[PDB]
Amino acid sequence: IEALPTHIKAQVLAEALPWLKQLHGKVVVVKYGGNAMTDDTLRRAFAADMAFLRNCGIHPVVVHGGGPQITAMLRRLGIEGDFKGGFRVTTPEVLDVARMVLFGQVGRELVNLINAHGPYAVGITGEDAQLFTAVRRSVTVDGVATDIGLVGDVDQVNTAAMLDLVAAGRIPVVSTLAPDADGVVHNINADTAAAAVAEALGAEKLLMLTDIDGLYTRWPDRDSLVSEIDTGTLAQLLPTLESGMVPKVEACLRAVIGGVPSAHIIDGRVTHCVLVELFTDAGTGTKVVRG
Amino acid sequence: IEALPTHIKAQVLAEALPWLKQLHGKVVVVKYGGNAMTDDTLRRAFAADMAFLRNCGIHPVVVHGGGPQITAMLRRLGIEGDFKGGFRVTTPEVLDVARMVLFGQVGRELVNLINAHGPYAVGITGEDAQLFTAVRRSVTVDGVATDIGLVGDVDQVNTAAMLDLVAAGRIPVVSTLAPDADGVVHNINADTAAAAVAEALGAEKLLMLTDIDGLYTRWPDRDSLVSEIDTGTLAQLLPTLESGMVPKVEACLRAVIGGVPSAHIIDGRVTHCVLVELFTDAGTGTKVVRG
Amino acid sequence: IEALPTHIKAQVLAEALPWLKQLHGKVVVVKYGGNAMTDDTLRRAFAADMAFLRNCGIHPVVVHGGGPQITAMLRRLGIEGDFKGGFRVTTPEVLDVARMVLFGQVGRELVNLINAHGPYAVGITGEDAQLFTAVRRSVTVDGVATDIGLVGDVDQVNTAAMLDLVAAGRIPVVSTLAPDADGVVHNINADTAAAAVAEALGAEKLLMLTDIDGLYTRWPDRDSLVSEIDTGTLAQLLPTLESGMVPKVEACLRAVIGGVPSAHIIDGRVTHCVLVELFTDAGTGTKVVRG
Amino acid sequence: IEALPTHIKAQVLAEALPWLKQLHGKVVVVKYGGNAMTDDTLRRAFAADMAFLRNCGIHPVVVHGGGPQITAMLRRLGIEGDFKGGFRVTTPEVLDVARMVLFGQVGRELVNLINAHGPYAVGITGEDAQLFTAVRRSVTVDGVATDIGLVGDVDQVNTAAMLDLVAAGRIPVVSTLAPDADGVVHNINADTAAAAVAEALGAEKLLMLTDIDGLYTRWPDRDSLVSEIDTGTLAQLLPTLESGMVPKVEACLRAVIGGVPSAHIIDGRVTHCVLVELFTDAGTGTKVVRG
Amino acid sequence: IEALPTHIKAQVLAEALPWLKQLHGKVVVVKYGGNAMTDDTLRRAFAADMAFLRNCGIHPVVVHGGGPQITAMLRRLGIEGDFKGGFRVTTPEVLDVARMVLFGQVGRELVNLINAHGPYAVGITGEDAQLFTAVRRSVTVDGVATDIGLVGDVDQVNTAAMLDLVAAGRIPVVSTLAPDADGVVHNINADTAAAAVAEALGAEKLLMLTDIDGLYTRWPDRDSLVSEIDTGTLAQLLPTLESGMVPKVEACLRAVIGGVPSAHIIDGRVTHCVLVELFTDAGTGTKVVRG
Amino acid sequence: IEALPTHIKAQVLAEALPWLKQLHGKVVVVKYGGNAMTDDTLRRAFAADMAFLRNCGIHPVVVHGGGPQITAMLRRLGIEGDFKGGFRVTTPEVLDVARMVLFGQVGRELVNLINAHGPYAVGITGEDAQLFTAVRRSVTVDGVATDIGLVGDVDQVNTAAMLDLVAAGRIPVVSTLAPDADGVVHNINADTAAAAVAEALGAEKLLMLTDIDGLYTRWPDRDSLVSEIDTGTLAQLLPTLESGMVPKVEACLRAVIGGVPSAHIIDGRVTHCVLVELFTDAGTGTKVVRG
Numbered sequence A, B, C, D, E, F: 001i002e003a004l005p006t007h008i009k010a011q012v013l014a015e016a017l018p019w020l021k022q023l024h025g026k027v028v029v030v031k032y033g034g035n036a037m038t039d040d041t042l043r044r045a046f047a048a049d050m051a052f053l054r055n056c057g058i059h060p061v062v063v064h065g066g067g068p069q070i071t072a073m074l075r076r077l078g079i080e081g082d083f084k085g086g087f088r089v090t091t092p093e094v095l096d097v098a099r100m101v102l103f104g105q106v107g108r109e110l111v112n113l114i115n116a117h118g119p120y121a122v123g124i125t126g127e128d129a130q131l132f133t134a135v136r137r138s139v140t141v142d143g144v145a146t147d148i149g150l151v152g153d154v155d156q157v158n159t160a161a162m163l164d165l166v167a168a169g170r171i172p173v174v175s176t177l178a179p180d181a182d183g184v185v186h187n188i189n190a191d192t193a194a195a196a197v198a199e200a201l202g203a204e205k206l207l208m209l210t211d212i213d214g215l216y217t218r219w220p221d222r223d224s225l226v227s228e229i230d231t232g233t234l235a236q237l238l239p240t241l242e243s244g245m246v247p248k249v250e251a252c253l254r255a256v257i258g259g260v261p262s263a264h265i266i267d268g269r270v271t272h273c274v275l276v277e278l279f280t281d282a283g284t285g286t287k288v289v290r291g
């Protein structure tokens, strides 16, 4: 990494300058999940990159999922699930496990990783200081909308308290659980929650770490892969895409139409993907803008 | 509760005035555990009382344990323990479970209970914003000091950041886990941690909720029960007391000699015990002062 | 007062919690007069209660009258009065005496009483820092409106400066005298002034200490005594009531229609009446709301 | 006043500049009494001059006496006095009258006069916000120190709260009454109180308005009149001077040795004497400095 | 200057009080040029007067020209000029000289003069912190508008940053040079720039130091000289006046119609002219108001 | 610059992280001179790099020289010099030219260049707000110390005001001229001034842009070139080095012994040299530390 001449090291850094200018003093929300969360080297790079942002006076906010870890814990506890369509029903018991895994295990790991660089990270959920509330959602299955227990969407966000938290120099690491209007805690899909936090905080950018190069319109044609797309076009394309690309794309839409200047689908399998997408013009991600 | 004449309701409230004066703008640390934590009616009273303090401009800080809940979860997970003396060894696996139970389950319940009264509670551990660190402890068993894994005492406390957190109008609910100097998270005995937080924050009072009327010098003589005692006297008495009274008493000593004006052993089985001990002269607790 | 079991002392305090929540950080204006001002034990309770409010982070503002004390001083000075209808004419000489008695005697007593609990009280009049101005009033007598000298109503209030004064942690004790637009000081009826200060400061509650159990619609039927009433109903009832109840009722109307959520007519002859009315559901007072 | 050429009007103003520089942002304490207080034209000039100071960003503090007005009121009330030596005994009754006259009459007049120029003046006594306390004094008479009732010297001053009051842009007008350690209000000699306030607030200058051209060492030799003198010299001269010059001179000593850079005895019978002494080199006063 | 009695020194100062009140905490923009800039005694008086304003808590802002000094320097450098009509073309070379003379010579002299009284003055141009921008102007010559190089009018002003600069206690000394939208620095006529700064900063007054007694409507009739005039009247009169009076009059118009309460044409040949015009009713200047 | 794979672009940026952490919120003083100042491409890179620092929340301060430009201007003006030893005597006339060239020409260019990236740069000299003073220096020539006119060293620095200037988000661009204790402006060697500003402001680093690869102990042996050296060693080596390396080395000594953690001699002929030296381990410069 040093057989590389130092006059070229210089230009790489200098080309970061226009993005440092654009993001300085701005909040960036990052949905962190997938492989970028399960592999040790990529995890540490992700944390080091949150430290980078904070040491540039940029204000990152991290929203994390953790579907597979909840499943494993429920299996470890011998808790048998009920399934409507493809969805597990979130009984009170399943929520307790979810909350405990998301907040007490997955969030802790990232807080400690980030904090290796300084006292930056702080874990929270909608429960803490009533930072955000949830409204119960229903999913549509094989035709008909259906109840699947204590699952919801972000309802309201204490935009004010959240931004004080970051002006204090903090990186919030959010576990997507929040109570409803009656104090009953729901679990929120982490992709949609990221989009709701981005819009509530006036984020400059929403980053969505996923396990793919970027959005393919005609998957799997190699050259159907697109670099940038507007919301109107992407909305017309949404009904066609793979099962798992929908949440990451629905999020990018609801954020960008909500006023977030751009959402980005970037490849979480690339070390320092966020540095690459934010401070470099050579990213593999897909950028969503309003249109 | 209203067959009681209203001229007597008045005097009860008026007699709270000298303690409102003394605690106004002061931090009070409360170790919350025992039955006050397992019974539904007593839990809700405890939360309502934290709301009371905060709505008097007093600054409560809650430190909670949860020994029995960790044990149950380890049994649920089929994780076999190792025991030196009376102590379970805290392997990395046991810590993960502990952390997840203390922070992801027990702390959450109190945060939501308190927050029924407003956006006050916020959960944290030494991991968040590096608020406090731990140093590995060893226990003495049948003669010889011995290692029992990832267990420690509070090392350093970010006194500054902690008090900003409460000046913002927050009730911190602390789960006693913190990392050491190398980022390795330890579990800390909640009683000792409360005493360390009280001393670090310049608390005016340290409250220790336990499952007993108060300190008995000659248990179980009914009239060996004492109302107030100095540290020097209590230190000479410590080697004699029941197995479980030691941590609550060691804490009261280390706090009061650390400069905390008084520590109190109060009966967590009494509804609104903290209201009674703080704003009334008719408490059953034991008050420890320096001597 | 201690033959009363301590589990009942607890519940009295706990039932204060919803009113502590509602008044926290709010201004409460209190018109103080009548017997609550002439009896030593009731005076000290009143002061101790202002200290209570301030030590709950509530912001009391006291407005006081003192009709009988002015009369006595004028008699002591051999100053013969002129009377149109039932009203003494407020010559420049009578105003000087009034101002000197209200501000230099009656207000001083309450400032010192309150200040026994801390550096809270501060005496003022509309003259100080131009906090409020007066406009000359005329009274109606046996048919025709008539001039009775330097008597007026509150004109304008420096809402801003007044609230800075209380955010500093102060209890203003107001003597109802203020200058007009030309610097000519008038004496203002203390009941009406309280209502004007309450409305100007966005008070949460207006308390009116009087010498009666509460409002009687058909005095003196014992069960004509009412617990709560709306402004529209009370306005239709106002033309019927005793000579002295009019000012306290006109005040409650003009405050509540001015946007103050409730005004209260409470019995100043009850020790700690304000504690009882504010933090207890067992008050004898009458609550006025908008309707 | 305009037959005077405008190039000379200019130089008068320009010669004020070095004293504007020296006093900018500084507190000046002014003892106001004597004729400067009893004549209408001189009163209005005095008030206009306090407005001048405040509109130069100088921070005046006014301390006033009023001996003759108390005497007249006591005579009006038929309150017979007791006299040890030359001193009236200050019974509780005499204090009430004093307090009421000083605070409720004399202070009010100056507050309104000053306030004709803006919302500047605010009246206070040691009672308000516990701004200062008194300690009972005894006088020496024909040889032996003797008690003369509720008379004292300034004990402690809340320097902090006082300076916040002036940073808010206020002119405090102080009536020299304060409570002792037990809440018992004493009357304080206004000259000595001014000296104590000057020293407590780190005043830059202490002004003493009196009814004389200045200090005469050999009164009444016309040319014994001095322009400046040091404390050591003036202390040796103090035992010789007229009965009434002692308090004004004792004050100047205790202030200047207390660290106040200069005290000044200026002629209150000169219109705008304070403008002349502060912003002009042609004053008749006497300046006391440390030596 | 002291054969003048001190009771008259007093009244001169006291008559300043209503203008101290009106200007306290207000910004006053002063165009400084002409003889008031070339004569040593008048220069020092001008600086001492800026110190005066600042030590009254008034916020002066100085805008300076310097036409003749640029001309001399260009002649010293042997830089031959081109002239369309009466105007020199401002080539890039002429701008560099102008900028260097205005900012590096003329502004420095005033900064040091003022700073003899304290750390007040600070020199700037539109280039510093992008405080203001310029738009290229064209002049009209013998009929047709024509380009004369890098000369412009003030375009936009960072009103916010400018007022922070003065709230810090600073006297900005502005050299009228600023960049356009593309970073190309233009030279701005100092009279027009003063008018633009006055309007942008919400100045209370605009002072224009010139080399004349005041505005003459029928120059040179001695009694055509006017004391005050409205914008509508002065606009109808503008097409008639001497060649050099136009810029000072156009400025006063554009300021006063821009909302500045008054602009003043005052005689820079009078020592302390600004003291005379601001704090005295005996000025020779001409006051422009809206009409 | 893009035939370079994007996984390597990532690592270049990530390796900046430990230096972003170390410099975040810290002041870095940069002496800017030599070729880095005369070539267009290197100038723009230097400005872009100051923008970089400011957009990382680092606080750069620029100190510039300009010896050759003064010489050229004096020649353009036909001002004949006097020379003692190798030094031109700085007559009042030469200072005026120097001041005008340094502040009115050289500083302006950098302010505008930097400001192309935002409203960051602000030009100043010790004259502005009395930010720093000078003391007259004498040089030693062929044996004997000798006067060479208005040349000096930095005397005192208003550390406070300077750091407020940068906390406002500003890049000060300093022209090394300041007045002495009597207001007489001197010209200060820019290298020594940088060292004095670095020490006064508690700079974290002092950067010295020069026209050489780095310090050579045995110039011109190619491998006498050193990467790091302590002050004690460098002090013993100073008497041997080339004529022009002395000021840059004396500066690095006086800074580092003054408590600045490191001074750096870096090659101003390298594009983005400051990015390379600050955020990369591959710099050609020489680092001076205390020893």
Ligand SMILES: CC(=O)c1c(O)cccc1O
Pocket: A122, A123, A124, A128, A129, A165, B122, B123, B124, B128, B129, B165, B170
């Ligand atoms: C949300 C909040 O206030 C917070 C927290 O939840 C944890 C640590 C520090 C903090 O300031």
Ligand SMILES: CC(=O)c1c(O)cccc1O
Pocket: C122, C123, C124, C128, C129, C165, D122, D123, D124, D128, D129, D165, D170
């Ligand atoms: C109204 C005010 O400012 C004040 C006062 O009138 C008396 C004592 C302290 C104060 O702050």
Ligand SMILES: CC(=O)c1c(O)cccc1O
Pocket: E122, E123, E124, E128, E129, E165, F122, F123, F124, F128, F129, F165, F170
């Ligand atoms: C405009 C500014 O910020 C400034 C300056 O240009 C010079 C000295 C101090 C300052 O605050």
